[PDB]
Amino acid sequence: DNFNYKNDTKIIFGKDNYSEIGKNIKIFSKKTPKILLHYEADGELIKKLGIYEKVISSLKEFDIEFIELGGVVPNPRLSLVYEGIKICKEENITFILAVGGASVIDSAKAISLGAVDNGDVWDFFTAKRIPQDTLGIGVVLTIPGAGSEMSESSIITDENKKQKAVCDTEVNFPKFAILNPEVCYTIPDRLMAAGIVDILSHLMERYFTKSIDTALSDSLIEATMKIVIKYGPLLMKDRKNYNYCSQIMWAATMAHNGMIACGRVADWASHRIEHEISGIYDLTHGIGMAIIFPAWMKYTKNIRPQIFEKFFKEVFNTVNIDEGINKLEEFFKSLGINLKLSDYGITEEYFSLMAEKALGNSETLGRFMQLNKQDIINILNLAK
Amino acid sequence: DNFNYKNDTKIIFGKDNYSEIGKNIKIFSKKTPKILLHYEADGELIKKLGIYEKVISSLKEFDIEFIELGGVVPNPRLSLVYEGIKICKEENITFILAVGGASVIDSAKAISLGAVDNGDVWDFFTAKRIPQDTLGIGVVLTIPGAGSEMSESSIITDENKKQKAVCDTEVNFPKFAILNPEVCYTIPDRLMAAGIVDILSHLMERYFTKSIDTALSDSLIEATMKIVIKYGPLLMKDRKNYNYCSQIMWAATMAHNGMIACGRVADWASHRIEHEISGIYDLTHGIGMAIIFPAWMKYTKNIRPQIFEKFFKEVFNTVNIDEGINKLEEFFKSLGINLKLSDYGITEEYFSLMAEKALGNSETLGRFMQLNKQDIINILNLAK
Numbered sequence: 001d002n003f004n005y006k007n008d009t010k011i012i013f014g015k016d017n018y019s020e021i022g023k024n025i026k027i028f029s030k031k032t033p034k035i036l037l038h039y040e041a042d043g044e045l046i047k048k049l050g051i052y053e054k055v056i057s058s059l060k061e062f063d064i065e066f067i068e069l070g071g072v073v074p075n076p077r078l079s080l081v082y083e084g085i086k087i088c089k090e091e092n093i094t095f096i097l098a099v100g101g102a103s104v105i106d107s108a109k110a111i112s113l114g115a116v117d118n119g120d121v122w123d124f125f126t127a128k129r130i131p132q133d134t135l136g137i138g139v140v141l142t143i144p145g146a147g148s149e150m151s152e153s154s155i156i157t158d159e160n161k162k163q164k165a166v167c168d169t170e171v172n173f174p175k176f177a178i179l180n181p182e183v184c185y186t187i188p189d190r191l192m193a194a195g196i197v198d199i200l201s202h203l204m205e206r207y208f209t210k211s212i213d214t215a216l217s218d219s220l221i222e223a224t225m226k227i228v229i230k231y232g233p234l235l236m237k238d239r240k241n242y243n244y245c246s247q248i249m250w251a252a253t254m255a256h257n258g259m260i261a262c263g264r265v266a267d268w269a270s271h272r273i274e275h276e277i278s279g280i281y282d283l284t285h286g287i288g289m290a291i292i293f294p295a296w297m298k299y300t301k302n303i304r305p306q307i308f309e310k311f312f313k314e315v316f317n318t319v320n321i322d323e324g325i326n327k328l329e330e331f332f333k334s335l336g337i338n339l340k341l342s343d344y345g346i347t348e349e350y351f352s353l354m355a356e357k358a359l360g361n362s363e364t365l366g367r368f369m370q371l372n373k374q375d376i377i378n379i380l381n382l383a384k
Numbered sequence: 385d386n387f388n389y390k391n392d393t394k395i396i397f398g399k400d401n402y403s404e405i406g407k408n409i410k411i412f413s414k415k416t417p418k419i420l421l422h423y424e425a426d427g428e429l430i431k432k433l434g435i436y437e438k439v440i441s442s443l444k445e446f447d448i449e450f451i452e453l454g455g456v457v458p459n460p461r462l463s464l465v466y467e468g469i470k471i472c473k474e475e476n477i478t479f480i481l482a483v484g485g486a487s488v489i490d491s492a493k494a495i496s497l498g499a500v501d502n503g504d505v506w507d508f509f510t511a512k513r514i515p516q517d518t519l520g521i522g523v524v525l526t527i528p529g530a531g532s533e534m535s536e537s538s539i540i541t542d543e544n545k546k547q548k549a550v551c552d553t554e555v556n557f558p559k560f561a562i563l564n565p566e567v568c569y570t571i572p573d574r575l576m577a578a579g580i581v582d583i584l585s586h587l588m589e590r591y592f593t594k595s596i597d598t599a600l601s602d603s604l605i606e607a608t609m610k611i612v613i614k615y616g617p618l619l620m621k622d623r624k625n626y627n628y629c630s631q632i633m634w635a636a637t638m639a640h641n642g643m644i645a646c647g648r649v650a651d652w653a654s655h656r657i658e659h660e661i662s663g664i665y666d667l668t669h670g671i672g673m674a675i676i677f678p679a680w681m682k683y684t685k686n687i688r689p690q691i692f693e694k695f696f697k698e699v700f701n702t703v704n705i706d707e708g709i710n711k712l713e714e715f716f717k718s719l720g721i722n723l724k725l726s727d728y729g730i731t732e733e734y735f736s737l738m739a740e741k742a743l744g745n746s747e748t749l750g751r752f753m754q755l756n757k758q759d760i761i762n763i764l765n766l767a768k
């Protein structure tokens with residue numbers, strides 16, 4: 001097992017450092033800077049928090065001209081990205097500032113691409129052309145979600161065709177990303193808890209592998225996981241604790257690092273199964289990953305028991321799988337999450353439909369264990 | 385404690401992937417590529433190993449024209465860098481390939497700088513100008529030493545003035561670095577052992593800190609250390625074991641990462657003390673770090689016993705400092721290293737001189753503990 005790793009995104013970690021917005025705009029723009037401030041809706045919640053102010057005060061401090069463009073919505077649409085390209089060519093924008101989460105970061109990245117291209121940007125999403133340049137964006141992250149502030153990916157939906165797509169390319173890497181743990185404070189409980197589950201589950205999806213010779217990698221992923229297991233419950237009970245939020249934020253960041261996962265083989269079974277639950281019921285990703293992941297490890301405990309033994313020894317101080325699986329169930333409950341699907345009024349009614357749609361045009365799904373339609377129903381039964 | 389992190393060096397990790405030399409030259413050169421192959425002496429040992437061949441076979445495979453420039457020597461001299469600038473401007477070299485260790489990588493970086501500048505390169509080392517561009521280098525690392533294949537630093541000595549200096553700048557970052565663990569195999573024992581000590585000591589220098597709120601960081605540094613403690617002895621006894629060499633190489637790399645050390649405050653006391661031992665006697669850095677580090681932790685065990693308790697609990701499975709200090713002494717001996725200075729015929733004769741030269745024009749030295757001249761002699765007495 002060989003692997004490659006690049007990641008050029010500059011990370012500014014900490015608080016009381018709002019000048020680094022302006023400072024980093026200067027470090028990464030073309031000559032004199034004029035920037036596009038991108039946000040969701042009308043900076044409604046960004047401004048409520050006081051980010052909008054502390055942003056514009058950094059922009060002013062550095063004499064940076066700027067236009068605002070708003071209304072991105074959770075599933076960012078080409079409607080708006082096309083509008084954004086227009087503005088970055090007309091008003092000669094030299095840099096984009098994404099002030100939000102992945103929904104706005106993905107929009108920002110797609111604008112950054114189109115602003116430097118002499119074609120349609122959507123040729124970069126539908127596998128027609130491979131972009132070779134981007135204007136350049138900076139992010140101020142408002143919630144440590146899925147790491148788009150450090151990824152090479154942008155997910156956009158063409159609502160004219162109802163066809164959503166993604167574009168992975170080294171140019172999409174943000175030039176810099178401001179990461180202040182303080183943005184965690186105002187996040188509602190259920191969402192903080194679900195973000196904590198997403199961090200662990202991202203680590204676990206990569207940890208549980210058939211790959212061999214991954215000792216150091218194992219250690220690092222174990223280390224991050226343990227911290228999630230130790231601090232995430234403390235953060236839930238002391239929401240404004242900078243330390244607790246720092247560990248957790250730094251964990252999510254590290255979880256999106258492929259220095260700790262070194263070309264070891266990830267498994268997406270849980271993700272996919274959860275996707276289809278979430279596709280039919282109103283259920284937050286992180287919550288369904290806490291219901292499904294335990295069900296899946298029960299169902300897959302026989303593949304490489306040794307790597308399950310290891311997991312629970314290193315993370316929950318136990319060599320007994322059942323006990324460990326329960327310690328993880330308990331830990332999820334420690335974040336205020338109920339563990340069964342019945343609990344959310346999800347019934348067995350669509351376990352069949354959900355299993356079919358997970359598999360799509362395939363016979364099985366998974367890598368650690370090849371899971372067929374009935375295997376998936378069994379897992380949904382374990383989680384009911 | 386806030387911190388920043390960038391590192392743009394692409395890492396190609398693994399074996400049986402010699403085509404990625406050519407492939408990565410193509411990915412990072414100007415238009416058609418013509419490269420300078422940089423090595424130590426006359427590719428004497430690089431060629432003995434079979435790197436030279438597998439390099440030129442990748443260069444040919446990709447139709448890459450190339451000139452060779454040799455004779456870099458362990459303390460790379462401007463004599464040669466000036467020669468290299470000449471060649472990269474005359475022969476219009478678009479990229480440099482450093483095939484060696486830090487001595488040649490540092491030379492390569494200094495050539496890369498000068499080849500794009502309209503001045504003297506040495507203005508970049510003597511704090512006159514701050515370089516804003518470099519041609520671009522790739523490294524094939526022959527020994528996982530001090531990480532220059534991923535650093536922003538180049539250390540060159542002007543032998544006309546007997547004045548050596550360094551240049552830290554984001555442009556010095558190699559464009560890519562090939563890391564094949566197999567290069568470990570041929571390394572002599574004393575040097576492999578000393579490289580294993582350097583990895584741990586780089587982690588320890590950063591670990592033992594007065595900084596607070598560093599839990600995740602602690603975990604990661606602990607994780608890497610443990611692996612060094614576990615595999616390094618196995619590697620010493622099974623030199624050609626790819627797994628053992630992979631963990632250890634990946635540890636050194638990770639040790640040079642500031643994602644695991646997150647702006648926590650390093651201490652260089654041991655380094656400095658060792659420097660002066662090495663300045664007077666013929667002693668390999670790694671070996672004197674195994675004699676000195678234990679002496680220093682004995683002498684500094686009273687500062688934050690809690691972080692010593694933690695260290696030895698996480699790494700040596702013990703809460704007792706004395707026992708732990710001994711487990712670390714034992715571990716060093718497990719790499720075939722004798723632990724006293726007497727052992728190397730180093731006598732107390734110059735403990736005084738060595739202490740004075742460590743302190744230079746300062747009253748104390750260290751951050752974890754401020755060490756004065758007598759404190760340093762005491763530490764040298766602990767290590768005698």
Ligand SMILES: NC(=O)c1ccc[n+]([C@@H]2O[C@H](COP(=O)([O-])OP(=O)(O)OC[C@H]3O[C@@H](n4cnc5c(N)ncnc54)[C@H](O)[C@@H]3O)[C@@H](O)[C@H]2O)c1
Nearest residue numbers: 101102103142143145146147148151153154155183186187
């Ligand atoms: N690399 C990639 O491109 C990548 C990878 C995985 C997922 N994604 C995408 O990530 C998106 C999920 O985004 P996300 O989880 O970062 O969140 P988000 O910002 O898209 O939405 C988070 C929710 O919490 C609120 N919120 C955000 N920050 C807050 C704060 N500081 N205080 C209070 N409330 C706050 C928002 O109003 C919203 O309701 C999806 O579109 C998903 O497809 C992208």
Ligand SMILES: NC(=O)c1ccc[n+]([C@@H]2O[C@H](COP(=O)([O-])OP(=O)(O)OC[C@H]3O[C@@H](n4cnc5c(N)ncnc54)[C@H](O)[C@@H]3O)[C@@H](O)[C@H]2O)c1
Nearest residue numbers: 485486487526527529530531532535537538539567570571
């Ligand atoms: N970031 C930086 O720029 C930075 C930081 C710290 C130290 N340094 C510098 O690093 C240098 C030390 O270099 P290094 O430790 O990487 O080693 P090196 O390559 O300079 O020398 C290593 C020794 O082992 C031999 N060797 C190397 N690879 C071998 C292999 N595969 N098989 C057998 N023998 C092999 C060499 O012949 C030589 O005797 C010093 O000049 C030091 O100042 C630079």
Ligand SMILES: [Cl-]
Nearest residue numbers: 145146198285
């Ligand atoms: Cl997610």
Ligand SMILES: [Cl-]
Nearest residue numbers: 529530582669
């Ligand atoms: Cl070193």
Ligand SMILES: [Co+2]
Nearest residue numbers: 201202205271
């Ligand atoms: Co997931």
Ligand SMILES: [Co+2]
Nearest residue numbers: 585586589655
């Ligand atoms: Co050192």
